Design a binder for this molecule. Sequence first.
Ligand SMILES: CN(C)CCN1CCN(C(=O)c2cc(C(C)(C)C)sc2NC(=O)Nc2cccc(Cl)c2Cl)CCC1=O
Ligand SMILES: CCCCCCCCO[C@@H]1O[C@H](CO)[C@@H](O)[C@H](O)[C@H]1O
Length: 332
Amino acid sequence: RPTFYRQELNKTIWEVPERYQNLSPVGSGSVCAAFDTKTGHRVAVKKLSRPFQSIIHAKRTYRELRLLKHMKHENVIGLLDVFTPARSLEEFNDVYLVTHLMGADLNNIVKCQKLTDDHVQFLIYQILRGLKYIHSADIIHRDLKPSNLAVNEDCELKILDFGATRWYRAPEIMLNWMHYNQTVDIWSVGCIMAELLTGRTLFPGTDHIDQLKLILRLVGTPGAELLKKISSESARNYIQSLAQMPKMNFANVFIGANPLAVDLLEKMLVLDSDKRITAAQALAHAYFAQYHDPDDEPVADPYDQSFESRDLLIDEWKSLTYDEVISFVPPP
Ligand SMILES: CN(C)CCN1CCN(C(=O)c2cc(C(C)(C)C)sc2NC(=O)Nc2cccc(Cl)c2Cl)CCC1=O
Ligand SMILES: CCCCCCCCO[C@@H]1O[C@H](CO)[C@@H](O)[C@H](O)[C@H]1O
């Protein structure tokens, strides 16, 4: 069991093994960049804030540990290490997670290099590939946007969650529809891709209602087939009252873009989540012919998330979390 050492960073106490050097704040859990003096590579180390404060917190701690221990894909954050100072369960009250440091996020790439059609094809391919793997474990990202995308200098990408966000949110998450299918994340990819093509935020809503108005101006007011599914008496009368926007002709909107990009955008940015292309379908889209390889778009091992429907005690969440810390095997 390594020797730990205590350090102070922007008001936070950090106890990590010696192995991890040159800590410097990256944001606020909180996250430091560090040098792994054991393998020679830069890492990001996340310290979980108040992991066991609530039942909701204690569960979310367990969730994060479980999810990350299961993600083993090129385009999704992976776990290099997980550790705690605590030599036993009684002492246990802090959690740290370790991943590969990617040096920049996608907003950074976007505000200071105008991207080629070839770049957009590569970056969105990678999001979809990571997303196929995510979706096959039955997991929904729900908060996909450029700041949750890590990119290196070869423009290689991983999907992650640092925890407006609204600009990339599916209109149904902002109406609290509640079931949500995995294409919520495909609506996000549409917003990300549009902005990679344009250099501009597709939907810069000022707030929650402006967001929705902006979306409705692009895609139009809901079609009969969609109105049809609004089981809620509620919505329907309100929507029919609105300025009855027709769906904008996307070719006209994303003018000079590759026509396969446009066509892929029309298949992601559909109001009706039942009609949006899946991550799998999208990888087979002709827009990605240069990068597509059906033998190299792997799906995840079965993910046991029976724990999600469980209501347990803080002490149980914590002890479960501890066993997950103990059982961690690092990758090669
Ligand atoms: C209900 N719910 C889907 C929304 C809230 N979630 C967020 C999702 N989550 C997560 O923990 C989560 C899920 C992820 C995918 C993309 C695979 C979907 S990535 C990630 N966490 C993460 O990226 N951590 C991290 C980031 C930078 C540096 C370091 Cl060092 C690390 Cl450890 C688990 C916690 C929770 O409850
Ligand atoms: C302002 C009008 C925008 C509302 C967007 C509704 C489109 C979401 O799409 C809907 O999502 C649900 C999954 O949560 C599905 O159950 C519905 O069948 C599907 O049509």
